[PDB]
Ligand binder design. Sequence first.
Ligand SMILES: c1ccc([P+](c2ccccc2)(c2ccccc2)c2ccccc2)cc1
Lengths: 89, 89, 103, 102
Amino acid sequence: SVPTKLEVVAATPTSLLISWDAGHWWEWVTYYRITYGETGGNSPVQEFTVPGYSSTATISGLKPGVDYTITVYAPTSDYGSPISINYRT
Amino acid sequence: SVPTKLEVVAATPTSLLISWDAGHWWEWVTYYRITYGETGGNSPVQEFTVPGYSSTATISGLKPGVDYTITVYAPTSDYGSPISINYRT
Amino acid sequence: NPYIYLGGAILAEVIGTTLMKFSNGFTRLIPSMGTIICYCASFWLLAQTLAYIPTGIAYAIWSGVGIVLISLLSWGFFGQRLDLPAIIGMMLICAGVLIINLL
Amino acid sequence: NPYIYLGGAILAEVIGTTLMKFSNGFTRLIPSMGTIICYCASFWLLAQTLAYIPTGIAYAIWSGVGIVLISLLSWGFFGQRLDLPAIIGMMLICAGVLIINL
Ligand SMILES: c1ccc([P+](c2ccccc2)(c2ccccc2)c2ccccc2)cc1
């Protein structure tokens, strides 16, 4: 279910601006955690959390040209599967 | 009774690094506030706060050759009278 | 008058406690906020009412009206009655309280 | 298991309110930081022990073991034991806890 529609709004070569349909009224969660790492798995994944009232997040400091995998989770898996996406900067 | 021993460690013509004996582990207050202003009173004094676990502070943005009245206040007056000192940059 | 802020602080905790059962372990926004909001309002009314009312009359009234108004909500938003031997076990917990406070 | 974290939150609160009576207007940093840690720990210990034991059941045992562990702590270290013919009232709270227990 939540979240929905994880899209990259702005995309500087070193920063991705991601938003998501946070849900509604009752399905609003307290915090989202967002994971971004290299798409080849050569490294582990970086990770931050964001207050659950906000539905956007700024992922800064990447490497240009490289494709990335952006994941957005919920506090628990009881809200649904994580909506993971990709983007080449 | 607290805090105690307000003095100026380092003193540039425009800055006054001040410290104070916090006390002991079981007698730390949540915060202090530092009041520094011109010793005469041509304008209001300057004011800020410092977390209570720290015991030193640095006052910047002063005018050289001028003497100042630095006063440190506890969170409340229960902890005793505020300690005030004077220093000429 | 201070007995009216009492129930206002009792009922506020009564609500926030039931909103806490709804917050999924503080992982659902709005039920997590409401619990934080309620326990603030139930704290502030407690200060205005125990500012000068005895802290044994206020506790016992809270410990009883609260032991009822949240169990009737737990049963209103679910049920369970006496899952384990006795509901009276909570009625006599409420009794042993009212004698180390008032006696 | 559920009656383990219920009492663990009672201990956190009992120390939470006491460390608050020691500190002034939340002003003494060390005992005040204890209260916030004691409260925030107990706040999350109750939310978890609430999904297993009904709300009204835990609320009872909560208020029960509280004043138990409060007057037991009031007399053990501070003194008081006022209304000494109330240790029967401590045996009463125990019995009610027992006949709702496992
Ligand atoms: C952390 C701190 C305080 C409470 P409680 C409480 C009472 C009844 C049921 C659950 C929790 C409390 C207060 C005083 C003594 C014992 C317990 C609490 C918190 C806010 C307002 C009212 C009561 C809980 C967790």
